Design a protein around this ligand. Structure first.
Ligand SMILES: CCCCCCCCCCCCCCCCCC(=O)OC[C@H](COP(=O)([O-])OCC(O)COP(=O)([O-])OC[C@@H](COC(=O)CCCCCCCCCCCCCCCCC)OC(=O)CCCCCCCCCCCCCCCCC)OC(=O)CCCCCCCCCCCCCCCCC
Ligand SMILES: CCCCCCCCCCCCCCCCCC(=O)OC[C@H](COP(=O)(O)OCCN)OC(=O)CCCCCCCCCCCCCCCCC
Ligand SMILES: NC(=O)C1=CN([C@@H]2O[C@H](COP(=O)(O)OP(=O)(O)OC[C@H]3O[C@@H](n4cnc5c(N)ncnc54)[C@H](OP(=O)(O)O)[C@@H]3O)[C@@H](O)[C@H]2O)C=CC1
Ligand code: SF4
Ligand code: SF4
Ligand code: SF4
Ligand SMILES: [Zn+2]
Lengths: 209, 66, 124, 89, 151, 114, 118, 189, 376, 182, 89
């Protein structure tokens, strides 16, 4: 009746809802919460210790068969006490479905590596350590994968300046490139893109304490 | 010394197939009095460009002499 | 022989002006705010005759990406990406356009830009 | 050369002692000659009869947004966008 | 458990390695007041000189909306800028000057600042606005001065 | 104000102290190789001081977990230097040679400007 | 006999009926050790019976695959080899217990960093 | 209290000292292409100086110095040492002039008379006319009024010219600084 | 090294010519793309995705565009779908030509590079004719594409397609049945099916080894519902069949264009909502609401409701996904981008183990890795 | 800006001549060097060998310059791999910090006379990633640049126009004629 | 006549070599569509109607609700599978 609004896929929504509960019974020790996102995508919020167990369960159980691990995204949120969240995007070819597993960790506390369950996470975990600074215990060989050698800090934390602290230049005295404290000809011009009027009332009262 | 940049804007569209109509065969071309004659790209030359701030300085310093 | 291109081609920039001769740009600064590369810097001041106008308009062509968002956002078609794509220089400094350089292009290329806009504005 | 001491329409120029003129010893300083402040001043105002008129820059969708002007006051009235002047007599 | 073979790694591991495999499961205690300045990678010079101001962003007087002041923030000191010699842009060698982070309460903001070694100082939280009557009928009052001469 | 946490590598400060010393061993062993295999001005005695100078930076560190992380990162560089993945430029980056001294006295800073 | 599995590096299985029967038999023994009220024990125990009987019920692998769906017999074995690993591994984790780590406050709150008024 | 030559704020010291800073110094390094010049120019570029680098030969030799500084802080100016009109153009805006012009041997167009004494004088004399505040010159350490040869019958000409060039420099630009190095080394030497 | 594509740094451990260990040192093209996106409005961040997977230009936009639409909870008009799907296939045909063209150079053959890059030049006239740029069109946008196709384009799209079969046959004659070509590819870099699933493989790497998987068929997201086409599958999981899959994909994609060109309807290009998509310029000059929305959509951009989503597409390289998070502001909170080649290069440690350089060079091409994907 | 001569005014101007030094040399020795200087420039001008750097998505448009549509090879431009035989380097892409020491070395290994071309915004001034924490803000920070080709990516013709600018820059070198004055 | 192609004899020779009749890759002005075309009249949208078009119905942004908690929304209110089985084999 209204073309602009996207049509929800109820059949896919129905299966994910019930199977979402199913996981909650099988893994009470670890599954803190299960929620169906507005995009009709399932999210499974687990405790930090339940990473390897839960991932194993989804990959090996007949009903889950989430054989394919697609991503490991890291999210930094300084507000929260355990500022770093880690999200696994799994795909199940046999059942043609996607599920998300989220977990939270602090700056220091290690996060059990999942190379075992899905050893596609060999580099994804390396990236997460490099970008955010989340350490992964039992990893084969944790090591920076993206940033420069000897780059100090972890750039993708929200508490890291956009331009970094040090630039590079060539110094003909030393016959090599040298690092100096940053000095920009034109600053990054912020823009205050903040709306003074709330637009989405549905989320005003959301998340009661 | 032929350059790709010697083509005046009148014929430029016709030369890059933007139009099938040469400047003679179209009357939609304007003839404003502030249009300028074509010019090469002048680099490595005494006639080249060089940027400069286009704003006069904002803060005036107090003059002791008066 | 060269080309072919299309009237939508994005190239070097140029500040147009009205047929009267007055500059189109009114220093609304939409182009600055949308420029993904932050390649635009504008400083505006109440002109002597009292019209909203720019005392500064700089594009850092070594920072622009020729996306074309500036010409879509301009409410008066002041800034356009002209047909020119042959403006390589021999010095980095010569690639930083200030308003006088941009205005000169808008006069050198005026005939062709006005023809592209006419043949293309309806789509846009 | 001449261009160094020329003063642009925005009103800026390097002082004859300012070192920044050094950048122009091997290049030129294009100062645009078609000053918009004078070309618009040249065009005469448009006499009208109605109390309010509109200017759209002259070419509809290729002009500026349509704005309406009120001509009750005596003085000829400038358009915000294009700078054209209107007057009722 | 069940018959199925035992893991060679744990089955053959010496008792010492199993022991340290246990206490590395651990759950040891550590004090909660920590400083992560050594590992955060900030240059030492910044950590010593630059203060951090916990504050609520100021409401825009030219608007009535408020949902853009529903957070606490951190902004660093306003170090020097200078005119750019070539084109006249604004220039600065102040990476942290660009910075901004959001928080839910000053306690979290202080907690975050302590964990990174920054020196901080909090602007006084705006006291909740006192109740205002704002009655309409008083605009038309018999003997009071609140009567409006306009409309 | 104490909390329960998961250890990083060690369980006791003494074990942490033990790990840190090993990192000093491996570096101190490695300096003679780094001088040979990198075209850099610095000599073994100068470098062996730089190792001492910087292990001193983290003089007041107390938390074992922080000491673990310093040793994780400290070890990572050594592997990247035991290998020559780090290039000539990166090794000399430990000296900040390009940056010239900034005077600390008030009168000099004032005259020099902020 | 299938000429080829159609998948690189997956070999046709000889006596898939036996290999499946052993694996399902093993799983039910590993699952048996789990506490009765564990929901995982109730589901796999229910499930593996539905797979196990079909393996014995049908003697033609093509008919077996239709009767069970869920891929070729070779994959059916590949699946079965997993829940041994899961069921065996999970006798050590004891997931059926209560929540190991109570969630922190605001740890799953979105959007973040908003003042909450008591 | 030394008077401030110009109070125009744009020509004052600004910034932290990095490449985007400004020393308020507008130098002119004659002979920047040489061995010493590569190191003088780079050290200036660190501070934020604006430098003009006159070059007599083809641009290819001097183009490598453009990396030393920042945008718009390095400018080249072709010049002929004999023609004063060329030199005035490169010294009419400078606060400092540095004269690293010299040779270890004679040429077909430039004898030690033309380079060390007549040339260096011309750069100094023109500088005083323009109004350069500072001036710097180089000379040998063993420089002497009449140096005696030691093994070559005509091996002392280079020092003789250097001494004479030193005096004419002090003659034309009386407050000129003179730095007398001895056996400089360190690469491309 | 020419075969490395100027980014890769393989620190090989050579026991003669055979490789015992390969260390793909990555990050020579890390440009912190995903941190810049956190500072840019959604529209300002669209060009960033043209740069990721820079050979599949309009396919990356589609992934980003679909992500924002799910959060915005809007639908695109019927016509815009066909334009999108049409240009997804044209991009796919472009990309496979680069893969086949580049892969041939690594082996040593030269002519297929030039015989195909002549057609590639014609194809990027259509990019230039609709978007105005031969590369990085920035054409697909969350509300649908940004402009209608020029009048008379579709005739020239047909004209190119009608002749493209012959061009692909001539390269096929010189390459497919060539005895030397088979030896340089056959049984080099075998990927067993069960290995691939565990690795996060996708795309032709997944279908090279016999797995029947294609997101266009399983999780359709555009006019792919309204078209019918086959999917190429390989049984041996080596370079050679994977090569054949790429060529066959270019045949089938040429089939989809045959249906797009005929089924294209007439209608609006953007979604109607002027609060998500800019309004027409003519309407901007006339109506007050259009001007306000134009003003706000460009300065402040549009507000996306809080939430997270993961959309993926069948990009030519593989599965390209974008895990986008929105915090209710005008800017994304975080934008993680799956690179299909990331998984592929992680597996190079073993696939090419116990092989020599001529084989490893071949494997690198068949992994089909456009860097910039791998380096965000 | 200096505008081009009008036809009637240009109708009188003498034919330009090939050499940019003219045939106005006073002496025989100077004139021979001038002509001999052209011979060098004609040589180096004719065969300019890029290095096949190809860093980022300018690199693709650096292939289409070698494609049949534009055919760099028509101008004597031949791609080469080793920096020893390569004469010109076309830095096309975003030179990140991790790369920066590698470009410097590769440039150094190139034998003189070596000219550098900067392709696209990335290599010109940092381009779209100018403010990133791991991007060298323009390759001119690292190596001298001789021609800047703007664009993102530059069109194939745009780069071709850039290459011809490098030929003209080569054509007017005064390597010999300035030795005489030296 | 209209196409600049090689002589008839070579065309036969070339045709023999390719093993198939050849269609010339090069585009000619006659085959393509003219570069100056009439101007378009792009249609409107479904919601350009003048009535019964309130944004409060058409809008989609304000209809998205927070994530739903699966476990609780039962309490307040064949084994399950993530979706429908597929034969990836
Ligand atoms: C094999 C290589 C040859 C390839 C075929 C093409 C060569 C011919 C050609 O291109 O003619 C162009 C030329 C057309 O151009 P143009 O408009 O008339 O004016 C030429 C320049 O603009 C005006 O010339 P310019 O002087 O301004 O600049 C060129 C410069 C330098 O000449 C060059 O550019 C070539 C490279 C440097 C000179 C090489 C010799 C080195 C030193 C010489 C001094 C001793 O000066 C010259 O040398 C030209 C003088 C002619 C005599 C050559 C001496 O043709 C001619 O005018 C003459 C016909 C060519 C000579 C044929 C003689 C046949 C004798 C049989 C043996
Ligand atoms: C195989 C085909 C080979 C073709 C060769 C053509 C050769 C043309 C010769 C021109 C010289 C080329 C080499 C060169 O570049 O020498 C330049 C040199 C000037 O260099 P310089 O003043 O020292 O620059 C400052 C450096 N700090 O110059 C000098 O110092 C002295 C110059 C004197 C004039 C020499 C002329 C030589 C002519 C040789 C013809 C060879 C023919 C046979 C080949
Ligand atoms: N061991 C040492 O270097 C010592 C230093 N000095 C003096 O320091 C000064 C610089 O040192 P250094 O770098 O080693 O000298 P170099 O020979 O290495 O370079 C000298 C510079 O001066 C230029 N030059 C030479 N003659 C002329 C001329 N007629 N006209 C214009 N320019 C000319 C050269 O330009 P180009 O090369 O382009 O032709 C070159 O750039 C020298 O004058 C030297 O006498 C004194 C004693 C010891
Ligand atoms: S084209 Fe895009 S990047 Fe370039 S100036 Fe315009 S808006 Fe900015
Ligand atoms: S958008 Fe147009 S009118 Fe506004 S400041 Fe930019 S050029 Fe001027
Ligand atoms: S300048 Fe543009 S086209 Fe070139 S590499 Fe950078 S983003 Fe890609
Ligand atoms: Zn008007």
């Amino acid at each position: 009746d209204k073309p602009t609004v996207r049509q929800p896929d109820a059949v896919a929504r129905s299966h994910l809802s019930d199977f979402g509960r199913y996981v909650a019974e099988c893994l009470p020790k670890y599954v803190q919460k299960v929620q169906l996102t507005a995009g009709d995508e399932l999210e499974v919020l687990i405790a930090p210790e339940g990473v390897v167990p839960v991932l194993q369960f989804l990959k090996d159980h007949h009903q889950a068969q989430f054989t394919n691990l697609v991503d490991i995204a890291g999210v930094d949120v300084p507000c929260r006490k355990n500022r770093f969240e880690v999200v696994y995007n799994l795909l199940s070819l046999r059942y043609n479905s996607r599920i998300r597993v989220k977990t939270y960790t602090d700056e220091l506390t290690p996060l059990d590596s999942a190379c075992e369950v899905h050893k596609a996470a060999n580099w994804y975990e390396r990236e997460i350590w490099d970008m955010y600074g989340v350490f992964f215990a039992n990893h084969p060989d944790l090591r920076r994968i993206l940033t420069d050698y000897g780059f100090e800090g972890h750039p993708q934390r929200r508490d890291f300046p956009l331009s970094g602290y040090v630039e590079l230049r060539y110094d003909d005295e030393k016959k090599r490139v040298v690092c100096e404290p940053l000095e920009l000809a034109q600053e990054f011009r912020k823009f205050d893109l903040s709306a003074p009027w709330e637009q989405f009332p549905n989320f005003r009262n959301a998340n009661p304490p | 010394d032929y350059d790709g940049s010697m083509i005046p804007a009148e014929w430029y569209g016709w030369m890059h197939y933007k139009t099938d109509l040469p400047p003679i065969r179209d009357g939609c071309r304007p003839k404003y009095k502030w249009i300028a004659d074509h010019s090469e790209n002048l680099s490595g030359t005494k006639e080249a460009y060089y940027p400069y701030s286009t704003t006069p300085n904002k803060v005036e310093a107090w003059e002791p002499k008066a | 022989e060269k080309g072919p291109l299309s009237p939508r081609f994005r190239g070097e920039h140029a500040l147009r002006r009205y047929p009267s001769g007055e500059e189109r740009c009114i220093a609304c600064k939409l182009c600055e705010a949308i420029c993904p590369a932050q390649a635009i810097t504008i400083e505006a001041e109440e002109r002597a005759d009292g019209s909203r106008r720019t005392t500064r308009y700089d594009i850092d062509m070594t920072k622009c990406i020729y996306c074309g968002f500036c010409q879509e956002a301009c409410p008066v078609d002041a800034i356009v990406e002209g047909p020119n794509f042959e403006f390589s220089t021999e010095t980095h400094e010569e690639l930083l356009y200030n308003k006088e350089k941009l205005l000169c292009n808008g006069d050198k290329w005026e005939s062709e830009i006005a023809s592209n806009l006419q043949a293309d504005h309806l789509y846009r | 050369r001449g261009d160094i001491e020329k003063v642009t329409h925005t009103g800026q120029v390097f002082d004859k002692e300012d070192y920044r003129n050094a950048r122009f010893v091997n290049a030129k300083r294009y100062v645009n000659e078609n000053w918009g402040i004078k070309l618009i001043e040249e065009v005469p105002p448009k006499e009208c009869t109605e109390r309010v008129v509109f200017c759209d820059g002259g070419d509809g969708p290729l002009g500026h947004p349509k704005v309406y002007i009120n001509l009750d006051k005596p003085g000829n009235h400038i358009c915000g966008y294009c700078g054209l002047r209107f007057v009722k007599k | 458990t069940d018959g199925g073979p035992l893991d060679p790694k744990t089955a053959l591991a010496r008792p010492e390695e199993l022991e340290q495999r246990n206490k590395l499961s651990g759950k040891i205690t550590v004090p909660t007041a920590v400083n992560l300045s050594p590992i955060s990678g900030v240059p030492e010079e910044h950590i010593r000189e630059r203060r951090v101001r916990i504050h609520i962003p100021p409401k825009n007087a030219m608007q009535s909306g408020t949902d853009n002041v529903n957070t606490w923030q951190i902004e660093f000191d306003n170090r020097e800028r200078w005119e750019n010699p070539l084109m006249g842009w604004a220039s600065s060698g102040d990476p942290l000057s660009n910075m901004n982070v959001q928080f839910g309460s000053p306690e979290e903001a202080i907690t975050f600042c302590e964990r990174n070694g920054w020196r901080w100082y909090v602007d006084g939280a705006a006291k909740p606005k006192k109740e205002r009557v704002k009655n309409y009928g008083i605009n038309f009052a018999w003997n009071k001065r609140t009567r409006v001469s306009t409309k | 104000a104490v909390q329960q946490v998961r250890p990083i590598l060690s369980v006791d400060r003494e074990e942490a102290r033990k790990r840190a010393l090993n990192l000093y061993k491996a570096w101190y062993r490695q300096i003679p190789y780094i001088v040979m295999d990198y075209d850099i001005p610095m000599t073994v005695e100068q470098c062996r001081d730089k190792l001492r100078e910087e292990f001193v930076k983290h003089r007041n560190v107390t938390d074992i977990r922080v000491i673990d992380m310093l040793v994780i990162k400290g070890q990572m560089e050594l592997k990247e230097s035991v290998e020559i993945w780090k290039q000539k430029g990166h090794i000399m980056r430990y000296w900040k040679e390009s940056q010239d001294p900034k005077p600390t006295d008030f009168l000099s800073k004032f005259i020099q400007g902020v | 006999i299938k000429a080829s599995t159609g998948l690189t590096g997956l070999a046709v299985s000889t006596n898939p009926h036996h290999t499946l029967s052993a694996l399902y038999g093993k799983i039910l023994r590993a699952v048996s050790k789990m506490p009765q009220d564990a929901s995982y024990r109730k589901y796999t125990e229910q499930l593996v019976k539905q797979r196990a009987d079909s393996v014995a019920q049908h003697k033609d692998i093509t008919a077996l695959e239709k009767a069970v769906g869920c891929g070729q017999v070779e994959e059916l074995i590949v699946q079965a080899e997993n829940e041994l690993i899961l069921a065996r591994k999970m006798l050590g984790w004891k997931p059926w217990e209560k929540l190991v780590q109570a969630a922190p406050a605001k740890q799953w709150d979105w959007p973040p960093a908003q003042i909450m008024e008591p | 209290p030394r008077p401030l030559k110009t109070t125009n704020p744009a020509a004052m010291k600004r910034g932290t000292g990095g490449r985007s800073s400004f020393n308020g110094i507008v130098a002119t390094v004659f002979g920047a292409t040489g061995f010493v010049g590569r190191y003088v120019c780079n050290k200036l570029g660190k501070s934020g100086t604006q430098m003009i680098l006159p070059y007599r030969g083809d641009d290819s030799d001097v183009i490598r110095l453009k990396v030393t500084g920042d945008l718009g802080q390095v400018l080249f100016h072709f010049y002929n040492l004999e023609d004063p009109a060329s030199i005035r153009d490169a010294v009419k805006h400078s606060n400092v002039v540095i004269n690293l012009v010299g040779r270890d041997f004679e040429t077909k167009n430039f004898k030690f008379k033309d380079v060390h004494v007549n040339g260096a004088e011309r750069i100094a004399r023109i500088a005083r006319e323009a109004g350069v505040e500072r001036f710097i010159h180089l000379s040998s350490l063993n420089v002497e009024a009449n140096p005696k040869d030691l093994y070559v019958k005509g091996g002392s000409e280079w020092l003789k010219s250097k001494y004479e060039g030193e005096l004419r420099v002090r003659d034309a630009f009386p407050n000129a600084t003179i730095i007398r190095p001895a056996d400089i080394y360190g690469s491309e030497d | 090294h020419p075969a490395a594509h100027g980014v890769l740094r393989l620190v090989l451990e050579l026991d003669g010519e055979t490789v015992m260990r390969a260390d793909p040192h990555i990050g020579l093209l890390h440009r912190g793309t995903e941190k810049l996106i956190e500072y840019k409005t959604y529209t300002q961040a669209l060009p960033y995705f043209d740069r990721l997977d820079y050979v599949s230009m309009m396919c990356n936009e589609q992934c980003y565009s679909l992500a924002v639409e799910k959060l915005l909870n809007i639908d695109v008009p019927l016509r815009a779908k066909y334009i999108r799907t049409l240009f997804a296939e044209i991009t796919r045909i472009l990309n496979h030509i680069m893969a086949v063209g580049t892969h041939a150079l690594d082996v040593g053959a030269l002519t297929p590079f030039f015989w195909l890059f002549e057609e590639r030049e014609k194809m990027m006239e259509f990019y230039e004719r609709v978007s105005g740029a031969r590369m990085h069109a920035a054409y697909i946008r969350p509300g649908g594409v940004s402009l209608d196709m020029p009048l008379g384009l579709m005739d020239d799209i047909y004209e190119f397609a009608s002749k493209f079969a012959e061009r692909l046959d001539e390269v096929e004659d010189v390459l497919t049945t060539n005895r030397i070509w088979v030896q340089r590819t056959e049984d080099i870099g075998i990927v067993t099916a069960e290995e691939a699933l565990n690795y996060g493989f996708s795309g032709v790497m997944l279908r090279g080894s016999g797995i029947k998987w294609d997101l266009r068929k399983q999780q359709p997201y555009d006019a792919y519902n309204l078209v019918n086409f086959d999917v190429p599958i390989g049984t041996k999981g080596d370079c050679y069949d994977r090569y054949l899959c790429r060529v066959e994909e270019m045949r089938q994609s040429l089939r989809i264009i045959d249906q797009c060109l005929n089924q294209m309807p007439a209608g609006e290009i953007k979604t109607d909502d002027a609060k998500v998509a800019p309004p027409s310029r003519s309407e901007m000059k006339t109506s007050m609401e259009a001007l306000i929305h134009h003003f706000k959509l460009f300065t402040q951009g549009y507000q996306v409701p809080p939430g997270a989503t993961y959309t993926a597409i069948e990009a030519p390289k593989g599965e390209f996904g974008v895990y986008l998070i929105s915090d209710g502001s005008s800017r994304p909170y975080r934008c993680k981008i799956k690179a299909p080649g990331f998984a592929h290069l992680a597996a190079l440690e073993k696939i090419g183990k116990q092989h020599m350089l001529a084989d490893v060079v071949a494997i690198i091409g068949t992994l089909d890795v456009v860097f910039g994907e791998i380096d965000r | 800006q200096q505008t081009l001569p009008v036809a009637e005014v240009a109708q009188n101007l003498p034919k330009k001549g090939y050499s940019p030094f003219g045939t106005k040399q006073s002496s025989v020795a100077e004139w021979s060097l001038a002509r001999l200087d052209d011979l060098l420039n004609w040589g180096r001008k004719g065969s300019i060998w890029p290095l096949t750097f190809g860093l980022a998505c300018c690199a693709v448009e650096m292939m289409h310059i070698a494609a049949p549509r534009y055919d760099m090879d028509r101008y004597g431009v031949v791609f080469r791999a080793s920096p020893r035989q390569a004469d010109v380097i076309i830095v096309a892409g975003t030179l990140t910090n991790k790369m920066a020491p590698a470009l410097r070395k590769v440039y150094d290994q190139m034998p003189e006379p070596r000219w550098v071309i900067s392709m696209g915004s990335c290599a010109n001034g940092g381009g779209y990633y100018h403010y990133s924490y791991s991007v060298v803000r323009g390759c001119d920070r690292i190596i001298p640049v001789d021609i800047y080709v703007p664009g993102c990516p530059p069109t194939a013709e745009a780069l071709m126009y850039g290459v011809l600018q490098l030929q003209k820059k080569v054509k007017r070198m005064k390597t010999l004629q300035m030795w005489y004055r030296k | 006549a209209l196409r600049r192609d090689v002589s008839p004899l070579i065309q036969r020779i070339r045709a023999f070599l390719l093993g198939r009749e050849h269609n010339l890759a090069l585009r000619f002005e006659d085959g393509l569509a003219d570069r100056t075309q009439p101007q378009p009249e792009i249609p409107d949208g479904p919601s350009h109607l003048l009535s019964a078009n309130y944004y409060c119905q058409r809008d989609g942004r304000r209809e998205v609700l927070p994530p739903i908690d699966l476990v609780e929304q039962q309490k307040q209110l064949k084994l399950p599978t993530p979706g429908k089985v597929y034969a990836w084999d």
